[PDB]
């Protein structure tokens, strides 16, 4: 069988799979108090993409389509097209269009547009509230709010490029975004479908290992913590390699190439998440050149050394 591997990149060299920003650090903490069910950055080790996961880091939390608005309002309704500007098919068995945000929050970015006929262009700062009722990407439409100057035209290609998140400063600090709360992709009173499953540690002494980034904040006091199960480069790597998984769990060693020393060992589950032997909240202290190395296909009989 084709030999499985993980990329040799350092943490700082890689990208968050849930927002188009670099990874900064590794974090482990208990997750019993909430449901860990991200739909971006979901991929099996043998290259099967899950949830809303797609390959391109820059496409994450973007939207494309055409927009309409009611005269005199600063809100725009985008009728979604696909990543390549083709029709969006709502019957595909995915939770929502690929790259849709998988958390409830207010995401700020720029909405840009070109007029096809003459190549005239326009852009405005814009926010999408993924916890709001008009957030219905599965149905093929979402709403953006702006403070307009030169209104967007109808029937022209329009793109949302995400930059950051916001929070209402008159309210309790860091009460949003809620990174572990899934939006209702079809809106109110409709259940999400075809979700990548929730993940949790199973064994004593185990915790999830999160790849962590700090989301830029554009207003107020947002919770800028964003954790993903897999770096986007790992998703890209597994998809390309498509190496058959020889067990449920790949044993990884986190290595310092300078000294040759193993910092800690961890389990990469075939369903695409990582666990370590630790209890409690902990920011990992890693050397800058440290990287993950695949050492063996193991199973439940193998116990991770305390981290």
């Amino acid at each position, epitope marked *: *069988s084709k030999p499985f591997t993980v990329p040799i990149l350092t943490v700082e060299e890689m990208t968050n799979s849930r927002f188009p920003i670099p990874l900064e650090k590794l974090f482990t903490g208990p997750s019993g108090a909430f449901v860990v069910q991200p739909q971006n950055g979901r991929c099996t080790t043998d290259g099967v993409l899950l949830g809303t996961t797609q390959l391109s880091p820059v496409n994450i939390c973007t939207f494309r389509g055409d927009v309409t608005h009611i005269a005199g309002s600063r809100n725009y309704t985008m009728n979604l097209a696909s990543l390549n500007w083709n029709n969006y098919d709502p019957t595909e068995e995915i939770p929502a269009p690929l790259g849709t945000p998988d958390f409830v929050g207010k995401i700020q970015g720029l909405l840009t547009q070109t007029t096809k006929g003459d190549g005239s262009t326009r852009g405005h700062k814009a926010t999408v509230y993924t916890g709001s009722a008009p957030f219905t990407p599965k149905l093929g439409s979402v709403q953006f709010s702006t403070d307009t100057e030169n209104d967007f035209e109808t029937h022209q290609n329009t793109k949302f490029t995400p930059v950051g998140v916001i929070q209402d400063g008159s309210t309790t600090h860091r009460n949003e975004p809620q990174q572990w709360v899934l939006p209702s992709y079809s809106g109110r009173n409709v259940h999400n479908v075809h979700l990548a499953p929730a993940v949790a540690p199973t064994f004593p002494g185990e915790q999830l290992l999160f790849f962590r980034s700090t989301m830029p904040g554009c207003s107020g006091y947002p919770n800028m913590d964003l954790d993903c199960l897999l770096p986007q480069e790992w998703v890209q790597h597994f998809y390309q390699e498509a190496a058959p998984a020889q067990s449920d769990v790949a*044993l990884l060693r986190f290595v310092n190439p300078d000294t040759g020393r193993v910092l800690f060992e961890c389990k990469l589950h075939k369903s695409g998440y990582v666990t370590v032997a630790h209890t409690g909240q902990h920011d990992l202290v890693i050397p800058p050149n440290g990287y993950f190395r695949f050492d063996s*296909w193991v199973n439940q*009989f193998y*116990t991770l050394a*305390p981290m």
Partner: nanobody, 120 residues
Framework: DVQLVESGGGLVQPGGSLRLSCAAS????????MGWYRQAPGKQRELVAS???????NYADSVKGRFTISGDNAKNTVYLQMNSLKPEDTAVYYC??????????????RGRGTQVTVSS
């Protein structure tokens, strides 16, 4: 394949102690886990204690604080020190090894087992 040689076991009164040992030979790999399962008649097997090559150990709750597994003496040998034995510990105890590689599924081997009986 891998061959496992078990030693120890027998009859002990409650509160007594026993030491088991298991040595592995043959096609063994550098990344592995070793340990013991037990099974009484008419019941399913349960994990007792295991030790992994990276130094991790696992103990069933029922034996925590009473049993210790170690692999720090003879080559490719693990030992189970069973202390403060209770009648509920009565079972067949069998050694188990999983050998792991980067290239193939895990390969499991298991010993014949030795009867442990805690009574009187």
């Amino acid at each position: 394949d891998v061959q496992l040689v078990e030693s120890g076991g027998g009859l002990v009164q409650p509160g007594g102690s026993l030491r088991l040992s298991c040595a592995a030979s043959g096609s063994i790999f550098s990344i592995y886990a070793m340990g013991w399962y037990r099974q009484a008649p008419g019941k399913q097997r349960e994990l007792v204690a295991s030790i992994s090559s990276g130094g991790g150990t696992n103990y069933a709750d029922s034996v925590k604080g009473r049993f210790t597994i170690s692999g720090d003496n003879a080559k490719n040998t693990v030992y189970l020190q069973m202390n403060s034995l209770k009648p509920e510990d009565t079972a067949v105890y069998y050694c188990k090894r999983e050998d792991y590689s980067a290239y193939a599924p895990p390969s499991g081997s298991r010993g014949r087992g030795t009867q442990v009986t805690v009574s009187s």
